[PDB]
Amino acid sequence: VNIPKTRKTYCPGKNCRKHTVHRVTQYKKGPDSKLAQGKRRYDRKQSGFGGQTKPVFHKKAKVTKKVVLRLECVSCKYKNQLVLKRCKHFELGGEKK
Amino acid sequence: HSYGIRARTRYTFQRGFREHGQIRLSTYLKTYKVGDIVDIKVNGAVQKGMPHKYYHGKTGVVYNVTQSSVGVLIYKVVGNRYMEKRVNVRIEHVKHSKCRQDFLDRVKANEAKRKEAKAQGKTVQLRRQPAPPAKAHFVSTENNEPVTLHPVAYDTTI
Amino acid sequence: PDSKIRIFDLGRKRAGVDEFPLCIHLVSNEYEQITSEALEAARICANKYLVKIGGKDSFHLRVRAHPFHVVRPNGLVARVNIGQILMSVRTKDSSRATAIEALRRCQYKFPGQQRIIVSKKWGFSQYARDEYIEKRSRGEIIPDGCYAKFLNKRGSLQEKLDLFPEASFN
Amino acid sequence: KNHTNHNQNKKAHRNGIKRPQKHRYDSLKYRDAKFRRNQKFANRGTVEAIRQAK
RNA sequence: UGAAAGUGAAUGCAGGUGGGAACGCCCUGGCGUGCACCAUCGACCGACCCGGAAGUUUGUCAAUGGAAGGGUUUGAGU
RNA sequence: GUAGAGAUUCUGACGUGCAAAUCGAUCUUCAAAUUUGGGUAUAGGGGCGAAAGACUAAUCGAACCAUCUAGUAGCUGGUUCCUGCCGAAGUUUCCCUCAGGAUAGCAGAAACUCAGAUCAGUUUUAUGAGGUAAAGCGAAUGAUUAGAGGUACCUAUUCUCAAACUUUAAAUAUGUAAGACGCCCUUGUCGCUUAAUUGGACGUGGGCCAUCGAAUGAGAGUUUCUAGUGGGCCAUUUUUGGUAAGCAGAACUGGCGAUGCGGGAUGAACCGAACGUGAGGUUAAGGUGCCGGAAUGUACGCUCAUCAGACACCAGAAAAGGUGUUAGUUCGAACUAGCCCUGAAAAUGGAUGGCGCUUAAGCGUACUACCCAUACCUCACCGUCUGGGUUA
RNA sequence: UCUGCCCAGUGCUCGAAUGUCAAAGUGAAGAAAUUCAACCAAGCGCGGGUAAACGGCAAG
RNA sequence: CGAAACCACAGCCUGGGGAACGGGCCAGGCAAAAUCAGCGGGGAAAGAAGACCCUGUUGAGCUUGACUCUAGUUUGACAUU
RNA sequence: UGACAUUGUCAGGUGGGGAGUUUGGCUGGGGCGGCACAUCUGUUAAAAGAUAACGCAGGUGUCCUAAGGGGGACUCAUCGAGAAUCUCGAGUAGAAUAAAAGGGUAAAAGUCCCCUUGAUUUUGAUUUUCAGUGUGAAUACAAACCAUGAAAGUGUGGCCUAUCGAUCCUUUGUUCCCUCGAAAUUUGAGGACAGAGGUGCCAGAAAAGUUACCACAGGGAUAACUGGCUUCAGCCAAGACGUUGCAUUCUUCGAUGUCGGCUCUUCCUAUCAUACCGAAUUCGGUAAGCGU
RNA sequence: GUCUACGGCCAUACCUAGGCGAAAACACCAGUUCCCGUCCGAUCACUGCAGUUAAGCGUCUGAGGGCCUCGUUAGUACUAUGGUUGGAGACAACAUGGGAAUCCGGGGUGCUGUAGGC
């Protein structure tokens, strides 16, 4: 699916409270931090004899992810997030029909 | 089985034969108030605001009025109780119950008879009564002499 | 599946409506089923007997049960009600005995019970003998191949006039 | 037997298909918001005007 | 009441409305009167979304502070 | 070949033995990888094994002892006095759930509230909704027989069909209404709505005011906690898969399960009727030759069977015939029916229940009398519940 | 009396890429916690040997 | 002189119905003490909570490139130095 | 021989030699298959709603910045007529409408053009599956913000009926937010609020075999084994054609000993022989006494 | 009564052939500078009344097609309930009730509301 790189949509930032142009990009999951509480608890739990202490997931059944649009206000820099339907092939600002 | 919203709705949501086309506009020119008793008849052309197939042919009382729809309250048997179902149904799928209008016309007539009975100093029995057995009557035979009939002999028509 | 019986009219199927006045029906007496192979075997028996006795020009035979009901695909059968006509033979008044015996022999090819009934209607038409005579007498019946056209009060006038010149339009 | 609806209607009618209790006043909440707002103000003036008349 | 920081329950006879126990008055009702309980419309307290009046001192332009007022949102509240 | 060490066969004896492995005969070896005493070493996830998972104190695909340990139990078994009162479920949704739980239903208790209300597995009246049966195919669609006409066609016809074709369209089911939370008039609030006190919603103040607005019958309703249940089965009718099935699967209702009694000889669901302890009377279903309570009753016929028939469910037979016979129909001939016979055919001796029954004690119809259930009726008594009294 | 053919695979065995490479240690950034960057044995991986190795009939 | 197994109660058949092969139930055939030696038709005879099969979120033996580990082994680092 | 090497600690790799565990369910027994395990249309289905089978005919894990939204003009599939692809007649949809099927659609919901991003933010209320829990999908509004149109109005994705996801954890957005509890500042972390990442066994364990050496607790809820039920003789005329007849899982898994032969007795007739008849040795009828 | 605008019910209104239509209205019609749109002012947009009732439009006619209503079909098919009814069954009959559809035949061929013009 092709999504235009820019769109005029409502900006819920308090400085805008109106429709404003937003730059559209694709949300990328951030790098996992070693110092998160879950990561720290996992390292504490995994240290020592006992083998594996947590479920490890294999039965990956989904083939595509919900694409997430990161809307970025041109005026007040406010950032919004929209989720769309699942798509196998995704374009951002491709050629119009 | 499949359990969609419009499953097995081929005949009930179908538009009538030679009744297809454009919806008549007296539907939109009608007024509904809360307390009105209305019938639900899902018009298949208008897909927005369609109540579920259970409510087709169901009659209820209006409880809410919006710009384009009507809130109808219907009692649906669920296991061992009637549960209050409040469907937001578009006015195309709605019509006034003629039974209510017949009742209101009868109420107006009853008040009229009561007023005239009071004015005349008489008592008028306002309860309807079921059909009674026929009265005694004479049946005249003049120019209507009885014709004696016998069962016909069996024959092979074809 | 293909039905075993393929021909459904035998004899002079082009015979005029006036030529064969007598009609004899082999009628099912029971609510039952008839197989396609049963229908064609009785058809062969009826055609063989009738052509042997009176010849191919003395009768018109029409089997009216069509094997349209599928049995569960392997074959086709004819679902028959009570009183439904299975076989029909139209002949002259002389061939009454021949047609009756032919249907009597063809009973043995069909399961269940059948009755031979001499229909009081003229030939294969729906009109009884007396009303067919009287309507033909006053002129609303015109033969058309194996059947006859009947004047009806509906339609235009000039077209009915030049198709039916003897008709007396009151 | 995986499924049947044999004894279910009997079980329903033993305590009867009971109807919900009828109340004179139903929630003006859960209705149209604009109507609810104005009816609050209309009710508030009505009770005050009754009080003033009394 | 909220995750917390924190804030923290009377516009009114501690409101209206409907039905209601018991009582009173009148000629069976009517009229008052309404406990208890539900239906419901509000008021108040905390969150949530706005709105920032004072006031405090420290950055007075500000920093901090939160009043009135509005949402028809919410709580295991008054 | 003997002693000795073995243990092939009889698949002999015995097989609660003499014996928890023995005896008899037969057989294998018999001077060496031989047989064997005592001493000594190797101990349990170990030993030892010319290897069979063999052996390791009658215990070995992990010895024995004691403890953890009363290990765990969706699994099997059992679970102890009486009467009275009420009385289920095998269904819903979710679960690594399918022999199990939770959840809803059904049930019991304990309360509270309302009240001529507030309703009903009901009818009527009024008014909706549906696409099944039926019908149709010369109304579209699909399939299909035959000629006629005008030229692969076209036109008027014709025979026959559809579970996912259909214009049409039932019966049975199903929704709602049938007033006092009513109606009529006046009039008030609003930030909503309108061109507008214009409406809409809620009200005030009045008037109408239990034939108060169909029938019939009932007092009605709401909380709280919790049990058991979450294998069902049969029949009526409808219906699917199946060659069929005492087969598998559903729908509606009634039953059995949980239920005795009368009857069908006998039987969980068939027929009748549902049950406190009794007396009398009367019936239901079904019966009245004898077993067996009760007419070897009445009336009119049919039937003769060389292995007749005899009561629903039900414990089974068809086409087609039969100089069997009794009646009919239409022109002696054909048909048409009712009974009988034929078609009809198994294995312990045996089944209308038996005995027997032939102008029946068989079959069809009609009419009386009779017999009898725990059902009905009257009465007595027991208990339960409900209602009304009781400060003498 | 013979014991054939096959090193593809699998297993065993022994030479080179430098592709990988943990903890140490080295360099930079930060106030540090640390975050980056480069290097690293073994095992690999690539390459040679091996069937009286498993196996097959890469060889048929 | 003197056991034991086994034992709901018992013990003549045919048929019916029935959890679809009754000793009992229903309808029949029938039916006279007390016993002895034989016998193997029946008592679906006795002998062991089927040892085949399935079920259980019950095991164990063995196997492998199952999951997860571990003795050992191997290499790097620091220590000893 | 030698600061090598061995040892102690750590970090890589190896490790069925050894340890512990697991090895989904549904299922006309299990197993193999299929996925009926999450879901849509038409049926099954008996004209409300509900309704089953490893019943039936196809589908779903996508696709689309337009194929979403608004406005405007236009009319479609066809068929006839005719000019070296457009021409005009008829044309109730016989076409198209992303994708299965069903329904809807004609100055449109189809086809072209024009402008857009309602495929937005924030509540509550409803509908369907339903326990009236959750998820999913949907409906009517209210408070903003917009698109479009002259306007009425329409628009909270697709004409309607499918196209999907908890706790924990991780990550992202938001606030000039809260906390790190002796007091601070800067990092870092933890919170509230809104999403995403994934559980297809789709209300969501992290899991290979084998057992003929096998073991338990059960099961006739469930197979094998025993039982039961179920699946040649005419009629017809041209001996053909026809037509009518003679798997299930109820019992048993606290066990009913499970082929054949031998032995032995009995019954049956659907008669090989024997007796006695009827036709033209052969075909028949009576016939199970007797033998085989 | 006729005509126009806006409608309601949405074929008794539609389709086809033929014959009429006085007034006004309506329509066809003249033109392309303007607003506007096209390959083409043919459509659409704009300005006007020189002619025509030829068409549209109204109406009458066809035992026209269709459609609508009534009767026939027909108390028929079907169906709720009932029987220890019949029949081996298929199915049928009866009892107390409910009750169609096609063919066919007759009639009909739009009614009406508001504001106006004649």
PDB file of N, CA, C and O (backbone and C1' of nucleotides) in Angstrom, chain F residues 16 45 61 74 76 99 246 265-267 348-351 353, chain H residues 4 13-17 19-20 26-28 49 55 57 61:
ATOM      1  P     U F  16      -2.895 -78.963  41.571  1.00  0.00           P
ATOM      2  O5'   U F  16      -2.559 -79.288  43.095  1.00  0.00           O
ATOM      3  C5'   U F  16      -1.493 -78.629  43.764  1.00  0.00           C
ATOM      4  C4'   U F  16      -1.915 -78.140  45.125  1.00  0.00           C
ATOM      5  C3'   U F  16      -2.288 -79.215  46.137  1.00  0.00           C
ATOM      6  O3'   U F  16      -1.144 -79.740  46.796  1.00  0.00           O
ATOM      7  C1'   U F  16      -3.915 -77.474  46.146  1.00  0.00           C
ATOM      8  P     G F  45      22.222 -46.462  42.810  1.00  0.00           P
ATOM      9  O5'   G F  45      23.550 -46.268  41.956  1.00  0.00           O
ATOM     10  C5'   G F  45      23.639 -45.244  40.972  1.00  0.00           C
ATOM     11  C4'   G F  45      23.979 -45.807  39.616  1.00  0.00           C
ATOM     12  C3'   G F  45      24.082 -44.782  38.491  1.00  0.00           C
ATOM     13  O3'   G F  45      25.064 -45.215  37.549  1.00  0.00           O
ATOM     14  C1'   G F  45      22.361 -46.326  37.996  1.00  0.00           C
ATOM     15  P     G F  61      14.747 -57.759  34.328  1.00  0.00           P
ATOM     16  O5'   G F  61      15.352 -56.511  33.547  1.00  0.00           O
ATOM     17  C5'   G F  61      16.197 -55.573  34.206  1.00  0.00           C
ATOM     18  C4'   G F  61      15.847 -54.153  33.832  1.00  0.00           C
ATOM     19  C3'   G F  61      14.387 -53.765  34.045  1.00  0.00           C
ATOM     20  O3'   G F  61      14.304 -52.391  34.422  1.00  0.00           O
ATOM     21  C1'   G F  61      14.936 -53.586  31.741  1.00  0.00           C
ATOM     22  P     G F  74      -9.024 -36.629  41.895  1.00  0.00           P
ATOM     23  O5'   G F  74      -9.793 -36.585  40.500  1.00  0.00           O
ATOM     24  C5'   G F  74      -9.501 -35.566  39.552  1.00  0.00           C
ATOM     25  C4'   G F  74     -10.393 -35.627  38.336  1.00  0.00           C
ATOM     26  C3'   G F  74     -10.247 -36.885  37.493  1.00  0.00           C
ATOM     27  O3'   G F  74     -11.473 -37.146  36.806  1.00  0.00           O
ATOM     28  C1'   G F  74      -9.483 -35.005  36.260  1.00  0.00           C
ATOM     29  P     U F  76     -13.908 -43.277  37.542  1.00  0.00           P
ATOM     30  O5'   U F  76     -13.704 -44.594  38.415  1.00  0.00           O
ATOM     31  C5'   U F  76     -13.826 -45.877  37.819  1.00  0.00           C
ATOM     32  C4'   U F  76     -13.404 -46.988  38.751  1.00  0.00           C
ATOM     33  C3'   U F  76     -14.260 -47.221  39.983  1.00  0.00           C
ATOM     34  O3'   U F  76     -15.473 -47.900  39.714  1.00  0.00           O
ATOM     35  C1'   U F  76     -11.983 -47.324  40.578  1.00  0.00           C
ATOM     36  P     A F  99     -13.310 -38.111  27.817  1.00  0.00           P
ATOM     37  O5'   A F  99     -13.831 -37.702  29.265  1.00  0.00           O
ATOM     38  C5'   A F  99     -15.119 -38.105  29.721  1.00  0.00           C
ATOM     39  C4'   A F  99     -15.138 -38.388  31.205  1.00  0.00           C
ATOM     40  C3'   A F  99     -14.390 -37.388  32.086  1.00  0.00           C
ATOM     41  O3'   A F  99     -15.078 -37.253  33.325  1.00  0.00           O
ATOM     42  C1'   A F  99     -13.506 -39.548  32.417  1.00  0.00           C
ATOM     43  P     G F 246     -33.303 -49.890  12.773  1.00  0.00           P
ATOM     44  O5'   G F 246     -33.505 -49.745  14.346  1.00  0.00           O
ATOM     45  C5'   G F 246     -33.534 -50.890  15.192  1.00  0.00           C
ATOM     46  C4'   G F 246     -32.676 -50.687  16.415  1.00  0.00           C
ATOM     47  C3'   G F 246     -31.171 -50.689  16.157  1.00  0.00           C
ATOM     48  O3'   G F 246     -30.539 -49.770  17.045  1.00  0.00           O
ATOM     49  C1'   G F 246     -31.709 -52.398  17.695  1.00  0.00           C
ATOM     50  P     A F 265     -50.210 -59.689  25.625  1.00  0.00           P
ATOM     51  O5'   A F 265     -49.961 -59.697  27.198  1.00  0.00           O
ATOM     52  C5'   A F 265     -50.811 -60.420  28.079  1.00  0.00           C
ATOM     53  C4'   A F 265     -50.039 -61.447  28.871  1.00  0.00           C
ATOM     54  C3'   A F 265     -48.665 -61.014  29.361  1.00  0.00           C
ATOM     55  O3'   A F 265     -48.725 -60.259  30.559  1.00  0.00           O
ATOM     56  C1'   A F 265     -48.536 -63.183  28.398  1.00  0.00           C
ATOM     57  P     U F 266     -47.993 -58.832  30.652  1.00  0.00           P
ATOM     58  O5'   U F 266     -46.447 -59.200  30.695  1.00  0.00           O
ATOM     59  C5'   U F 266     -45.925 -60.013  31.735  1.00  0.00           C
ATOM     60  C4'   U F 266     -44.585 -60.584  31.359  1.00  0.00           C
ATOM     61  C3'   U F 266     -43.518 -59.567  30.986  1.00  0.00           C
ATOM     62  O3'   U F 266     -42.865 -59.037  32.128  1.00  0.00           O
ATOM     63  C1'   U F 266     -43.577 -61.294  29.366  1.00  0.00           C
ATOM     64  P     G F 267     -42.958 -57.474  32.491  1.00  0.00           P
ATOM     65  O5'   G F 267     -41.925 -56.795  31.492  1.00  0.00           O
ATOM     66  C5'   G F 267     -40.587 -57.270  31.413  1.00  0.00           C
ATOM     67  C4'   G F 267     -39.757 -56.477  30.434  1.00  0.00           C
ATOM     68  C3'   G F 267     -39.797 -54.957  30.605  1.00  0.00           C
ATOM     69  O3'   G F 267     -38.511 -54.423  30.290  1.00  0.00           O
ATOM     70  C1'   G F 267     -40.459 -55.519  28.421  1.00  0.00           C
ATOM     71  P     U F 348     -31.199 -76.421  16.356  1.00  0.00           P
ATOM     72  O5'   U F 348     -31.756 -77.498  17.385  1.00  0.00           O
ATOM     73  C5'   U F 348     -31.355 -78.861  17.308  1.00  0.00           C
ATOM     74  C4'   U F 348     -32.010 -79.696  18.380  1.00  0.00           C
ATOM     75  C3'   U F 348     -33.529 -79.580  18.468  1.00  0.00           C
ATOM     76  O3'   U F 348     -34.069 -80.845  18.846  1.00  0.00           O
ATOM     77  C1'   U F 348     -32.568 -78.941  20.530  1.00  0.00           C
ATOM     78  P     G F 349     -35.251 -81.516  17.991  1.00  0.00           P
ATOM     79  O5'   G F 349     -36.554 -81.190  18.843  1.00  0.00           O
ATOM     80  C5'   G F 349     -37.785 -81.856  18.588  1.00  0.00           C
ATOM     81  C4'   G F 349     -38.959 -81.051  19.083  1.00  0.00           C
ATOM     82  C3'   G F 349     -38.930 -79.568  18.717  1.00  0.00           C
ATOM     83  O3'   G F 349     -40.257 -79.127  18.442  1.00  0.00           O
ATOM     84  C1'   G F 349     -39.039 -79.805  21.069  1.00  0.00           C
ATOM     85  P     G F 350     -40.565 -78.236  17.141  1.00  0.00           P
ATOM     86  O5'   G F 350     -41.039 -76.847  17.756  1.00  0.00           O
ATOM     87  C5'   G F 350     -41.679 -76.843  19.024  1.00  0.00           C
ATOM     88  C4'   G F 350     -42.142 -75.482  19.475  1.00  0.00           C
ATOM     89  C3'   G F 350     -41.071 -74.638  20.143  1.00  0.00           C
ATOM     90  O3'   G F 350     -41.460 -73.265  20.111  1.00  0.00           O
ATOM     91  C1'   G F 350     -42.642 -75.347  21.764  1.00  0.00           C
ATOM     92  P     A F 351     -41.413 -72.415  18.748  1.00  0.00           P
ATOM     93  O5'   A F 351     -42.932 -72.379  18.264  1.00  0.00           O
ATOM     94  C5'   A F 351     -43.674 -71.163  18.269  1.00  0.00           C
ATOM     95  C4'   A F 351     -45.064 -71.352  18.830  1.00  0.00           C
ATOM     96  C3'   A F 351     -45.700 -70.088  19.399  1.00  0.00           C
ATOM     97  O3'   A F 351     -47.113 -70.133  19.206  1.00  0.00           O
ATOM     98  C1'   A F 351     -45.466 -71.699  21.119  1.00  0.00           C
ATOM     99  P     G F 353     -49.849 -63.966  21.903  1.00  0.00           P
ATOM    100  O5'   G F 353     -49.529 -65.100  22.971  1.00  0.00           O
ATOM    101  C5'   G F 353     -48.212 -65.604  23.126  1.00  0.00           C
ATOM    102  C4'   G F 353     -48.116 -66.529  24.310  1.00  0.00           C
ATOM    103  C3'   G F 353     -48.981 -67.775  24.253  1.00  0.00           C
ATOM    104  O3'   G F 353     -48.436 -68.803  23.448  1.00  0.00           O
ATOM    105  C1'   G F 353     -49.231 -66.762  26.360  1.00  0.00           C
TER     106        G F 353
ATOM    107  P     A H   4      -9.045 -76.581  55.559  1.00  0.00           P
ATOM    108  O5'   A H   4      -8.853 -75.969  54.104  1.00  0.00           O
ATOM    109  C5'   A H   4      -7.581 -75.504  53.677  1.00  0.00           C
ATOM    110  C4'   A H   4      -7.394 -75.671  52.193  1.00  0.00           C
ATOM    111  C3'   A H   4      -8.375 -74.916  51.312  1.00  0.00           C
ATOM    112  O3'   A H   4      -8.021 -73.554  51.144  1.00  0.00           O
ATOM    113  C1'   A H   4      -8.180 -77.142  50.548  1.00  0.00           C
ATOM    114  P     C H  13     -31.441 -77.732  33.460  1.00  0.00           P
ATOM    115  O5'   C H  13     -32.097 -78.385  32.166  1.00  0.00           O
ATOM    116  C5'   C H  13     -32.454 -77.589  31.049  1.00  0.00           C
ATOM    117  C4'   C H  13     -33.560 -78.228  30.249  1.00  0.00           C
ATOM    118  C3'   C H  13     -34.203 -77.347  29.191  1.00  0.00           C
ATOM    119  O3'   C H  13     -33.458 -77.313  27.987  1.00  0.00           O
ATOM    120  C1'   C H  13     -35.888 -78.416  30.462  1.00  0.00           C
ATOM    121  P     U H  14     -33.183 -75.918  27.242  1.00  0.00           P
ATOM    122  O5'   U H  14     -34.513 -75.668  26.404  1.00  0.00           O
ATOM    123  C5'   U H  14     -34.925 -76.579  25.398  1.00  0.00           C
ATOM    124  C4'   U H  14     -36.260 -76.184  24.828  1.00  0.00           C
ATOM    125  C3'   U H  14     -36.433 -74.706  24.520  1.00  0.00           C
ATOM    126  O3'   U H  14     -35.845 -74.314  23.292  1.00  0.00           O
ATOM    127  C1'   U H  14     -38.305 -75.463  25.723  1.00  0.00           C
ATOM    128  P     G H  15     -35.178 -72.859  23.146  1.00  0.00           P
ATOM    129  O5'   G H  15     -36.423 -71.872  23.038  1.00  0.00           O
ATOM    130  C5'   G H  15     -37.367 -71.997  21.984  1.00  0.00           C
ATOM    131  C4'   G H  15     -38.635 -71.234  22.280  1.00  0.00           C
ATOM    132  C3'   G H  15     -38.473 -69.751  22.570  1.00  0.00           C
ATOM    133  O3'   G H  15     -38.320 -68.960  21.405  1.00  0.00           O
ATOM    134  C1'   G H  15     -39.871 -70.704  24.203  1.00  0.00           C
ATOM    135  P     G H  16     -37.318 -67.705  21.422  1.00  0.00           P
ATOM    136  O5'   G H  16     -38.188 -66.527  22.046  1.00  0.00           O
ATOM    137  C5'   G H  16     -39.465 -66.207  21.512  1.00  0.00           C
ATOM    138  C4'   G H  16     -40.347 -65.534  22.536  1.00  0.00           C
ATOM    139  C3'   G H  16     -39.846 -64.203  23.075  1.00  0.00           C
ATOM    140  O3'   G H  16     -40.170 -63.121  22.219  1.00  0.00           O
ATOM    141  C1'   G H  16     -40.559 -65.579  24.869  1.00  0.00           C
ATOM    142  P     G H  17     -39.016 -62.253  21.518  1.00  0.00           P
ATOM    143  O5'   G H  17     -38.788 -61.038  22.520  1.00  0.00           O
ATOM    144  C5'   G H  17     -39.853 -60.160  22.851  1.00  0.00           C
ATOM    145  C4'   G H  17     -39.813 -59.775  24.307  1.00  0.00           C
ATOM    146  C3'   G H  17     -38.567 -59.039  24.773  1.00  0.00           C
ATOM    147  O3'   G H  17     -38.605 -57.655  24.472  1.00  0.00           O
ATOM    148  C1'   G H  17     -39.085 -60.763  26.303  1.00  0.00           C
ATOM    149  P     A H  19     -32.715 -54.824  26.267  1.00  0.00           P
ATOM    150  O5'   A H  19     -31.266 -54.916  26.928  1.00  0.00           O
ATOM    151  C5'   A H  19     -30.114 -55.154  26.130  1.00  0.00           C
ATOM    152  C4'   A H  19     -28.902 -55.485  26.969  1.00  0.00           C
ATOM    153  C3'   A H  19     -29.009 -56.706  27.874  1.00  0.00           C
ATOM    154  O3'   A H  19     -28.668 -57.896  27.177  1.00  0.00           O
ATOM    155  C1'   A H  19     -27.920 -54.874  28.990  1.00  0.00           C
ATOM    156  P     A H  20     -29.754 -59.042  26.880  1.00  0.00           P
ATOM    157  O5'   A H  20     -30.180 -58.797  25.364  1.00  0.00           O
ATOM    158  C5'   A H  20     -31.058 -59.699  24.698  1.00  0.00           C
ATOM    159  C4'   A H  20     -30.643 -59.959  23.268  1.00  0.00           C
ATOM    160  C3'   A H  20     -29.211 -60.453  23.069  1.00  0.00           C
ATOM    161  O3'   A H  20     -29.181 -61.343  21.956  1.00  0.00           O
ATOM    162  C1'   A H  20     -29.523 -58.444  21.874  1.00  0.00           C
ATOM    163  P     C H  26     -43.403 -64.602  37.065  1.00  0.00           P
ATOM    164  O5'   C H  26     -44.102 -64.683  35.638  1.00  0.00           O
ATOM    165  C5'   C H  26     -44.793 -63.569  35.092  1.00  0.00           C
ATOM    166  C4'   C H  26     -45.055 -63.763  33.621  1.00  0.00           C
ATOM    167  C3'   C H  26     -45.588 -65.131  33.224  1.00  0.00           C
ATOM    168  O3'   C H  26     -46.985 -65.256  33.423  1.00  0.00           O
ATOM    169  C1'   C H  26     -43.816 -64.521  31.781  1.00  0.00           C
ATOM    170  P     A H  27     -47.621 -66.666  33.860  1.00  0.00           P
ATOM    171  O5'   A H  27     -47.626 -67.513  32.514  1.00  0.00           O
ATOM    172  C5'   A H  27     -48.324 -67.059  31.365  1.00  0.00           C
ATOM    173  C4'   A H  27     -48.077 -67.968  30.190  1.00  0.00           C
ATOM    174  C3'   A H  27     -48.151 -69.455  30.485  1.00  0.00           C
ATOM    175  O3'   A H  27     -49.482 -69.942  30.522  1.00  0.00           O
ATOM    176  C1'   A H  27     -46.208 -69.004  29.223  1.00  0.00           C
ATOM    177  P     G H  28     -49.800 -71.382  31.158  1.00  0.00           P
ATOM    178  O5'   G H  28     -49.309 -72.400  30.037  1.00  0.00           O
ATOM    179  C5'   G H  28     -48.788 -73.672  30.380  1.00  0.00           C
ATOM    180  C4'   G H  28     -47.880 -74.205  29.302  1.00  0.00           C
ATOM    181  C3'   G H  28     -47.241 -75.553  29.592  1.00  0.00           C
ATOM    182  O3'   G H  28     -48.097 -76.648  29.324  1.00  0.00           O
ATOM    183  C1'   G H  28     -45.573 -74.059  28.896  1.00  0.00           C
ATOM    184  P     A H  49      -7.060 -60.118  42.125  1.00  0.00           P
ATOM    185  O5'   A H  49      -7.596 -59.146  40.983  1.00  0.00           O
ATOM    186  C5'   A H  49      -6.784 -58.094  40.468  1.00  0.00           C
ATOM    187  C4'   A H  49      -7.527 -57.268  39.444  1.00  0.00           C
ATOM    188  C3'   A H  49      -6.695 -56.226  38.697  1.00  0.00           C
ATOM    189  O3'   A H  49      -7.186 -56.114  37.365  1.00  0.00           O
ATOM    190  C1'   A H  49      -8.486 -55.159  39.780  1.00  0.00           C
ATOM    191  P     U H  55      -5.716 -42.975  23.149  1.00  0.00           P
ATOM    192  O5'   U H  55      -6.355 -42.554  24.544  1.00  0.00           O
ATOM    193  C5'   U H  55      -7.674 -42.032  24.620  1.00  0.00           C
ATOM    194  C4'   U H  55      -8.157 -41.974  26.047  1.00  0.00           C
ATOM    195  C3'   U H  55      -7.238 -41.277  27.038  1.00  0.00           C
ATOM    196  O3'   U H  55      -7.341 -39.863  26.991  1.00  0.00           O
ATOM    197  C1'   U H  55      -7.985 -43.318  27.960  1.00  0.00           C
ATOM    198  P     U H  57      -6.307 -36.436  33.331  1.00  0.00           P
ATOM    199  O5'   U H  57      -5.369 -35.301  32.729  1.00  0.00           O
ATOM    200  C5'   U H  57      -4.130 -34.983  33.338  1.00  0.00           C
ATOM    201  C4'   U H  57      -3.017 -34.948  32.323  1.00  0.00           C
ATOM    202  C3'   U H  57      -1.658 -34.508  32.843  1.00  0.00           C
ATOM    203  O3'   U H  57      -0.955 -35.561  33.475  1.00  0.00           O
ATOM    204  C1'   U H  57      -2.149 -33.363  30.830  1.00  0.00           C
ATOM    205  P     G H  61      14.460 -44.963  33.882  1.00  0.00           P
ATOM    206  O5'   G H  61      14.717 -46.161  32.863  1.00  0.00           O
ATOM    207  C5'   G H  61      15.174 -47.426  33.319  1.00  0.00           C
ATOM    208  C4'   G H  61      15.136 -48.453  32.216  1.00  0.00           C
ATOM    209  C3'   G H  61      15.903 -48.096  30.952  1.00  0.00           C
ATOM    210  O3'   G H  61      17.294 -48.340  31.046  1.00  0.00           O
ATOM    211  C1'   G H  61      13.748 -48.806  30.357  1.00  0.00           C
TER     212        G H  61
END
